[PDB]
Ligand SMILES: C[C@H]1Oc2cc(cnc2N)-c2c(nn(C)c2C#N)CN(C)C(=O)c2ccc(F)cc21
């Protein structure tokens with residue numbers, strides 16, 4: 001019997017507004033003893049469901065909350081509690097003070113032209129993090145269907161402390177134990193043409209994700225309007241390689257965008273390739 | 289009664305050779321219970337005094353050991369023990385697995401042209417570290433007289449874990465409570481011309497040090513032979529600013545190389561300026 005973690009609305013204080021997500025509104029706040037009796041006023045994020053909103057939207061809201069209760073993995077955003085008896089509904093998430101990956105990446109590049117505040121090893125660690133999360137989703141028979149940096153989160157705001165990224169928005173995730181959409185730049189050709197979604201289209205999008213990471217948050221297909229994108233892609237056109245991107249990481253990405261879905265790597269292999277490259281590169285610098 | 293920390297030569301095992309420093313030989317090894325009874329086989333570095341070497345050199349060796357016993361500060365290399373009853377003499381230092389700052393800087397720049405493995409904030413933290421060490425030496429009435437990246441050490445080999453640099457070679461340090469030399473590129477004009485050394489010539493050299501940090505270990509005055517350097521400097525010539533070096537840090541460096549020794553900043557002000565710039569820059573990125 002699946003149970004969402006009920007949490008006393010009284011012990012929750014909404015302090016900062018972080019943005020307007022969904023329908024829709026997210027706040028930083030504090031929640032007493034979320035982590036237990038020896039917790040304190042630990043900071044949290046709060047996802048809210050607007051009052052009076054569609055009965056259908058409330059269901060999507062509840063769907064999300066259920067997906068996140070089900071998941072338990074270091075690279076998957078934690079849902080710490082819910083407030084569902086009173087409106088507005090609250091989904092209480094662990095606070096990721098670095099905000100969304102995309103923003104965290106772009107601040108890193110734009111902070112000083114002395115150089116990015118994230119290095120190649122930093123970026124490889126981000127990729128390794130998200131890929132573990134993908135391994136996990138696959139093992140749980142879930143397809144995320146919207147893998148992109150805007151949908152991941154970073155645990156710290158600064159660029160010096162140890163950091164972790166997590167997948168953090170499962171509004172489109174689907175169980176696959178057996179008229180909307182938008183993000184054309186992340187979608188596999190099968191998905192755009194035939195409306196088909198699989199773990200292998202997730203692999204296409206992870207390819208785009210790690211491209212986003214390696215460019216520090218550039219827009220895919222910068223010279224193409226949304227409309228031209230599907231032309232471009234459907235052709236056989238692919239993104240340009242990031243400036244000075246390691247050949248190993250380009251070959252991985254490239255294979256993620258195999259036209260033929262069964263010619264793409266698996267998530268396990270993708271994580272292997274990422275860990276393999278990291279060790280190679282670490283070893284490489286020390287022997288210098 | 290000044291006492292060097294005597295340590296049982298038996299509990300020491302010389303494993304790796306790290307290089308040949310002084311007269312002269314340094315090893316990585318392990319030393320049982322250096323940190324106390326609950327220590328274990330903790331890794332150390334070992335500075336050795338060659339057998340049969342000059343009676344005078346042994347004195348310089350002993351001088352160093354005494355200087356380092358006297359000092360206790362987070363940014364000054366720890367001397368953990370000595371082996372002075374038997375030859376070869378051993379000075380047992382905490383291991384700084386990043387090696388010397390200069391090498392650590394150059395590996396950072398040469399590891400991938402995707403970008404340096406040290407960012408501006410990393411480098412500013414290095415400068416802040418060494419400047420605290422300089423504040424301390426001054427407060428102890430000591431002049432180091434050879435401040436340079438080759439003479440500092442980094443606590444870790446990788447470029448991700450928290451790191452600290454320390455001043456680590458006091459072969460030339462002098463107490464100032466009241467025919468050798470070489471490093472012309474680090475020496476104040478008074479020092480080269482008149483053989484004069486003060487805390488203010490130390491400030492000149494720290495200027496050069498932080499230049500070394502900000503260029504990731506480039507040689508000062510690259511277009512000048514050692515001979516031409518004193519001409520160049522004695523004129524009024526100064527180093528070029530590092531590529532994309534923050535204006536605040538250029539103004540600091542520049543002032544460290546004031547022709548007139550009393551027109552140079554103090555170490556306290558230098559540390560203030562460094563901490564002030566760091567906060568400004570951190571604040572700067574977040575509000576972006
Ligand atoms: C549901 C929401 O959750 C969080 C948001 C933040 C931190 N931690 C969590 N859990 C956050 C953001 N920006 N900033 C400055 C902070 C902070 N601190 C991003 N944001 C406004 C979002 O709406 C968003 C975006 C993507 C995603 F996957 C979840 C979320």
Ligand SMILES: C[C@H]1Oc2cc(cnc2N)-c2c(nn(C)c2C#N)CN(C)C(=O)c2ccc(F)cc21
Pocket residue numbers: 306307308309314316333335365381382383384385386387388438439440441455456457
């Ligand atoms: C006296 C010596 O001490 C140490 C050396 C090292 C680490 N920790 C300590 N204490 C070290 C070095 N390289 N590498 C790879 C390691 C390691 N691990 C540098 N080196 C060979 C030096 O001789 C040297 C240079 C400058 C300085 F200030 C002290 C020293």
